[PDB]
Amino acid sequence: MHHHHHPRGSMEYEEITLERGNSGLGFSIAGGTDNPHIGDDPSIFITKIIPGGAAAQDGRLRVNDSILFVNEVDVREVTHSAAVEALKEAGSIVRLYVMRRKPPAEKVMEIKLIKGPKGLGFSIAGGVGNQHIPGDNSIYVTKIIEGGAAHKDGRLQIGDKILAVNSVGLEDVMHEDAVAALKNTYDVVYLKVAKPS
Amino acid sequence: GSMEYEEITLERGNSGLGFSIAGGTDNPHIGDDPSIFITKIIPGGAAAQDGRLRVNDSILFVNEVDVREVTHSAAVEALKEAGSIVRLYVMRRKPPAEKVMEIKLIKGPKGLGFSIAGGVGNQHIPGDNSIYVTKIIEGGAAHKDGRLQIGDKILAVNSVGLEDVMHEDAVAALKNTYDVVYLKVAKP
């Protein structure tokens, strides 16, 4: 199709090579143009993994992985049936190109800070055009300044996602936007943060 | 093309900051862009001696003032009332620091025997939608030929350019090829 289904989220791609067992590849799918599995998503999703099945023993593959390419076949936009056949006619060695979301944060907390004369004494990276991590518009703490408010409080650490400044969310925003959202604060600041996993 | 932000702190000379600007809501400098652009850099000027600042840099913040969307006049004043020590948050685009070659490959049964990363939503490098060679597979066609190396930008597959494309799009552009493939590459 002319337009493909770009997914809100922090994504991860992996190429999993499988050797067909005497019982297939040992996993189940769902979705496709004729029976979209989620929302308006014609993408193919892995619904099940069969134990002692080829996919299982390899163990790279995981449920809710989305399949984009079987060998050299593009299955982003096809009928369910179409995919099943592609998966059969894929021969004994099947190169799967799959995508899924990256692991959930270790945890989410809220940190109150009181601005030093230097500001909040810490730096950031990330942002929509400025992915600090391939496929991640999130905003991370680049560096914590010694003596700075962030240091004093000591709760905040490097690599923590900053999700919100006060009532301002930083989900998928321009790097400049985030910076602005911080300059435009008063003496007290409530940071909603996410500690990496 | 390669989005880059830098915070340049300047110490006002006895002649200002020594650079000129253009743009703003009242006189957009380029297309529909109300952004403030640096048009000139005065020699022996404060900005010059620092040398971090460069023409066509876009100014986002003067100290704590947001100048993404303001009138030209507005900015000039912000730049005056900014006191003796002026912190500038600027952005620009790096332009390709590469030499460029074309590599013909003949598909092995495994495909071209190499992997990629990067893409529009998948910046392999902050501010770079370019597509890079993640890994070269041993025995794979790419290895045999030996020309291709890790970290090389792939700019085109046959007649298909990969300038600012979705990661999936690039992958598709490679699956959808025949036994022979012409790769336009860029060595950094």
From Swiss-Prot, chain A:
Residues with the modification Phosphotyrosine, per the entry, are: 190
Q: Which residues carry this modification: Phosphoserine?
A: 23, 92
Q: Report the residue ranges that make up the PDZ domain in this protein.
A: 15-101, 110-196
Q: How is it modified after translation?
A: Palmitoylated. Palmitoylation is required for targeting to postsynaptic density, plasma membrane and synapses. Palmitoylation by ZDHHC2 occurs when the synaptic activity decreases and induces DLG4 synaptic clustering. Palmitoylation by ZDHHC15 regulates trafficking to the postsynaptic density and function in synaptogenesis. Palmitoylation may play a role in glutamate receptor GRIA1 synapse clustering. Depalmitoylated by ABHD17A and ABHD17B and to a lesser extent by ABHD17C, ABHD12, ABHD13, LYPLA1 and LYPLA2. Ubiquitinated by MDM2 in response to NMDA receptor activation, leading to proteasome-mediated degradation of DLG4 which is required for AMPA receptor endocytosis.
Instruction: List locations, semicolon-separated.
Output: Cell membrane; Postsynaptic density; Synapse; Cytoplasm
Tissue specificity annotation: Brain.
Source taxon at top rank: Eukaryota
Related illness: Intellectual developmental disorder, autosomal dominant 62: An autosomal dominant form of intellectual disability, a disorder characterized by significantly below average general intellectual functioning associated with impairments in adaptive behavior and manifested during the developmental period. MRD62 is characterized by mild to moderately impaired intellectual development.
Q: Which comment does the entry carry about domains?
A: The PDZ domain 3 mediates interaction with ADR1B. The L27 domain near the N-terminus of isoform 2 is required for HGS/HRS-dependent targeting to postsynaptic density.
Q: How does it assemble?
A: Interacts through its PDZ domains with ANO2 and NETO1. Interacts through its first two PDZ domains with GRIN2A, GRIN2B, GRIN2C, GRIN2D. Interacts with ASIC3. Interacts with SEMA4C. Interacts with CXADR. Interacts with KCND2. Interacts with SYNGAP1. Interacts with LRRC4 and LRRC4B. Interacts with ERBB4. Interacts with KCNA1, KCNA2, KCNA3 and KCNA4. Interacts through its first PDZ domain with GRIK2, KCNA4 and CRIPT. Interacts through its second PDZ domain with the PDZ domain of NOS1 or the C-terminus of CAPON.
Q: What is this protein called?
A: Disks large homolog 4
What is the species of this protein? Homo sapiens
Q: Which gene is this protein's source?
A: DLG4
